[PDB]
DNA sequence: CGGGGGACAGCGCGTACGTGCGTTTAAGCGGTGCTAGAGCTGTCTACGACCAATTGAGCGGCCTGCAGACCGGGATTCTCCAG
DNA sequence: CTGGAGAATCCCGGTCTGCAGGCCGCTCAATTGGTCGTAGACAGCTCTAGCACCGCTTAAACGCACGTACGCGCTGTCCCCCGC
């Protein structure tokens, strides 16, 4: 598993910005977006894995993700509750 | 006498007994008062009625007979106080409000 | 005998309208799962994943990214501009408290 | 095993306000999660209130105070009215 | 009764200076007055709520501490 | 005086510990200073050295207060 | 009556790290507030964890997980080391 | 990959700022005085925990018809341009 | 201004299908009734601090004159992002 952050293609970020209400986009944005997304994903997954390990489990559940998001002040509905 | 549900006694749709059980099992306090579960059930029922009413209005506006997460998101975000309450909540498959800034409009 | 091309920006407005009404995910699922597993590799090996978990990460990340894009658009407009600059993103994240 | 939820009561309220409106499963779970979250918020605030005042009981007064603290304006007022009405009805009957 | 005008422009200027602000428009002062007023309502409402639930008539500093804490603004040095 | 005047549309005849008043002043001043610094950053981003209320509005909007 | 605090223990810690540095009352008041804040954060997170796994007991493992979740990086590592060492020493003693 | 239109650099200006001095004010300090109300104490009583027996509401499993999704083809709208 | 032209979108039948919702058996969690212990509701007492007042004092706010630099409008250039 190497070089997957390039998997987020430029059209994907373009669609994300269009949903975000962005009309004109600079070309040197996408790598910054990828870095920020990587930071966010790392922060969430760290706590998710911490929860999974404290339960002595080997698979990560969505419910662990729910707790991790809740502890970071980002509550998500519709994934088990 | 025959058993009469406390929800019926207070005329509510939500299970007061289950609420009291959860209150006792939540380590919230040593003892739980008699009327507190009723109060909480009433509040939950009222809030549920509010959100469901707005979601149904939105779904009928979209001309569908079932409420989907999109209608829920629209109802929550369009209401000022509901959006204030759910300010830090992410709704799965909720989409976004179709808002466009004026300066980007073609002139 | 003309290509009949639209002016720069109207297509952008049309796709903004398109994507502000939809709710589906905008990212390919397989690359996102691969990246998620790659990131998780650095915390614990041989980790298995429920699919609902990966969907949860995808939804949360896309929502957060949309919010950040909306804030960045306001920041750039405050600079009386139309194109988004990375400095706008940096300022927005700093103001949010993430920096 | 068996898991419980608020699905039946939510469906009852939906039929009460919009008798001709259906609901999808995902939306139904969304309401379930929403109810759970509100429950946790009110319960935690009530527990903090009780601990601050050095009390052993969670009464309806604490629930009302937590509702006032956690709800914005008109929502808080209407919820307080509903809770008081339900408490009065249950006490009388 | 216009205690909002008790917040004179020298105090606003001083706060901006501590905030690292060099040049200030003249329209700023009233904006700060309004924002500060909004903040004060938000805090004081909860403070009074706590004071009343304790069945008291005098607002204590601990009430303000709790109100600030529940708003995400933790304060130390007062209990 | 401003605090006492504000503390009238919720309840009447409210007595105050001094410590509450000073804690309110501390919190208010800290919040105002942080808002000022954010406003300064916003104005600088607009290639300016002078802050005008639209900067405050944008700062509070991004902060989520709006 | 009498109110307890952390003044003596913080004073001893200060004398260990800076055996000559004094301190003002406002500083140790802030110290006690910070100590209480951290205590409540960790204890609440530990209780949340225990309820998450359907367990009635709070052990040192729960506190270790809570500290790992609440403290960033090197602080978390060092605190884990301190807690482990103290636990081992107390058990051996 | 063509190209337009947006980013940006540079310049004029006039005014809304900053800066300093004379003036008025009200904040701050110290003192006196009063009492409302916080805080503490004894009591008992009503209310909540707890347990035994009962049962029916709600959860699990099954099934189904229709809401909604998916085609396709005209109908209608929106935008661009040459006049 | 203003028709055409072309592309984009809407809409209305027509068809299929997964799940929303209803039905059913069962069981365990809610209910009912009775016991008992004890938390707090309540009355009563104390005395602290919060409120109000007054008189000085002086630092700070205020008003104002004045001058300049900066925010803003305008213009020309080019490059780079968009439509395809």
Author numbering:
A (entry chain L): 22 to 102
B (entry chain I): 12 to 118
C (entry chain K): 36 to 134
D (entry chain J), G (entry chain N): 29 to 121
E (entry chain H): 23 to 101
F (entry chain G): 69 to 134
What does the paper say about this structure?
The Rpd3 small (Rpd3S) complex recognizes histone H3 trimethylation on lysine 36 (H3K36me3) and deacetylates histones H3 and H4 at multiple sites across transcribed regions. The Rpd3S histone deacetylase (HDAC) complex recognizes H3K36me3 at coding regions and suppresses transcription from cryptic promoters via its deacetylase activity in yeast. Here we solved the cryo-electron microscopy structures of Saccharomyces cerevisiae Rpd3S in its free and H3K36me3 nucleosome-bound states. We demonstrated a unique architecture of Rpd3S, in which two copies of Eaf3–Rco1 heterodimers are asymmetrically assembled with Rpd3 and Sin3 to form a catalytic core complex.
To explore the underlying molecular basis, we reconstituted the H3K36me3 modified ‘designer’ nucleosome and prepared cross-linked Rpd3S–nucleosome complex for cryo-EM studies. Two engagement modes (‘close’ and ‘loose’) of the Rpd3S–nucleosome complexes were acquired in global density maps of 4.0 and 4.0 Å, respectively. In this case, one Rpd3S associates with the nucleosome disc from one side by grabbing two H3K36me3 marks and positions its catalytic centre of Rpd3 next to the N-terminal tail of histone H4 for deacetylation. Our structures revealed multivalent engagements between Rpd3S and H3K36me3 nucleosome, including two pairs of CHDEaf3–H3K36me3 recognition, MIDRco1–linker DNA interaction, and Sin3 HID–nucleosomal DNA interaction, which collectively contribute to the positioning of the H4 N-terminal tail towards the catalytic centre of Rpd3. The nucleosomal DNA at SHL +2.5 is recognized by the HID-C region of Sin3 with multiple electrostatic or hydrogen bonding pairs involving residues Q937, K941, H1221, Q1222 and K1244 of Sin3 and backbone phosphates across the DNA minor groove. Structural alignment revealed rotational displacement of the Rpd3S catalytic core from the close to the loose states, in which the MID domain of Rco1-A within the right arm leaves the linker DNA next to SHL +7 in the loose state. The existence of two engagement modes suggests dynamic association between the Rpd3S enzyme and its nucleosomal substrate, which may be beneficial for enzymatic turnover towards different acetylation sites occurred to histones H3 and H4 tails. Moreover, our structural study revealed that the catalytic centre of Rpd3S is far away from the H2A and H2B tails in the context of a nucleosome, consistent with a primary role of Rpd3S in H3 and H4 deacetylation. Histone H3K36me3 dual-mark readout by Rpd3S over a single nucleosome positions the catalytic centre of Rpd3 next to the histone H4 N-terminal tail for efficient deacetylation. Our structural studies show that the Rpd3S complex primarily binds to a single nucleosome through readout of dual H3K36me3 mark.
